[PDB]
Design a protein around this nucleic acid. Structure first.
Lengths: 177, 192
DNA sequence: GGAGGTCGTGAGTGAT
DNA sequence: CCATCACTCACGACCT
């Protein structure tokens, strides 16, 4: 009577195999706007609405460049900044600097990276800033806290041209644990 | 004296629209080889939920592409850990392909055991993840805890302890997003 | 009777 | 080496 007891486990397995895809198609209807509703559609129609609704420039990277950027900042608890290679002034700083470094965007914008770091590194800072699509990476101190809402901020990025319309250093800066 | 011939067509149609789903997934051509049906359903539930989330939401602030796609990938790889963002219910939203080296199993191979965060983590630790996920982000943010993901040998259950660190964020409005804010997290291992 | 969906088995490949 | 699992995929009868 062991063969029926093994086919019982196989039965429960093949039942879970179907009650899991029932969940994957229900959670394919309970999230898409096309079938968010009224009459509940059949399975094949939910799969067809998924095939179609998926089709918006999907053929790799799994993530729109800017979506990946926003999720990098929102996940690594970092911020993005573009700095100058001669003047050192920041030409753009993310909204993430108030969450991470406890400073408003104004206290960075217009200022330079030199006024914001620990001076005994600023010289080596120029080494990273001085150009001579290349990779740049450096650990550096940064003044943390001006009001409510010093730390180490590992900065990683690349040197590109500066097309404001559309050299500068574009970098993501995250605090090390 | 039968009812077959029609069920045989409903299945071949459902399980061909599923292969349509599979061919439309934005993964590398080489990764779309084994892909069990319940694995294609999982990859689809992730992608078609990692859009809506972005579709109905506010267009992401900031300029248009300051960094190249390959540059963002290189930064993602340089990270001492792997990004992993999932909704408050448990459903995943984006697993970083940098996990290929911090966990052994790649991204694709890992979302096969299920779709929820509660499918990749060792069940014993599940309770922990629930208490740090029930309370939404009223003001409680920057949560941190630990769990035993699931490094394995190709089927199921050494299990690497990981230190989840992240804070809840804003969800777009709608039915599905009813008190379901997304929770980004910088996942890092505890045994380098 | 038809459109749709649920339930167990028989058979394959492979991990262990 | 062998058996025994875990998983997968299809295929029918069957319900409701």
């Amino acid at each position: 009577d062991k063969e029926r007891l093994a086919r019982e486990n196989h039965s429960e397995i093949e039942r879970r195999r179907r009650n899991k895809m029932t969940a994957y198609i229900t959670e394919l209807s309970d999230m898409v706007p096309t079938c968010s509703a009224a009459r509940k559609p059949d399975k094949l129609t939910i799969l067809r609405m998924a095939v179609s609704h998926m089709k918006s420039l999907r053929g790799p990277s799994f993530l729109t460049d800017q979506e990946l950027k926003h999720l990098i900042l929102e996940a690594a608890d970092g911020f993005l900044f573009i700095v100058s290679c001669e003047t050192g002034r920041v030409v753009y700083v993310s909204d993430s600097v108030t969450p991470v470094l406890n400073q408003p965007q104004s206290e960075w914008f217009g200022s330079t990276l030199y006024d914001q770091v620990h001076p005994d590194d600023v010289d080596k800072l120029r080494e990273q800033l001085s150009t001579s699509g290349s990779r740049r990476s450096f650990i550096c101190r940064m003044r943390c806290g001006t009001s409510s809402v010093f730390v180490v901020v590992h900065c990683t990025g690349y040197i590109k041209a500066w097309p404001p319309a559309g050299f500068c250093l574009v970098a993501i800066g995250r605090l090390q644990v | 004296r039968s009812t077959k011939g029609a069920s045989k067509a409903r299945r071949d149609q459902i399980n061909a629209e599923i292969r349509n789903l599979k061919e439309l997934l934005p993964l590398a051509e080489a990764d779309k080889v084994r892909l069990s049906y319940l694995h294609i359903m999982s990859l689809a539930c992730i992608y078609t939920r990692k859009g809506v989330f972005f579709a109905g939401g506010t267009p992401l602030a900031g300029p248009t592409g300051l960094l190249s796609a390959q540059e963002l990938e290189d930064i993602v790889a340089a990270l001492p850990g792997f990004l992993l963002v999932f909704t408050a219910e448990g459903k995943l939203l984006y697993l970083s392909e940098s996990v290929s080296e911090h966990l052994g199993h790649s991204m694709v191979d890992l979302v096969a055991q299920g779709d929820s965060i509660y499918d990749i983590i060792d069940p014993a630790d599940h309770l922990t993840v629930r208490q740090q996920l029930t309370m939404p982000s009223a003001l409680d943010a920057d949560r941190l805890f630990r769990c035993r993901f699931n490094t394995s040998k190709s089927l199921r259950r050494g299990n690497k302890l990981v230190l989840i660190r992240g804070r809840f964020h804003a969800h777009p409005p709608g039915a599905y997003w009813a008190g379901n804010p997304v929770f980004t997290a910088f996942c890092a291992p505890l045994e380098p």
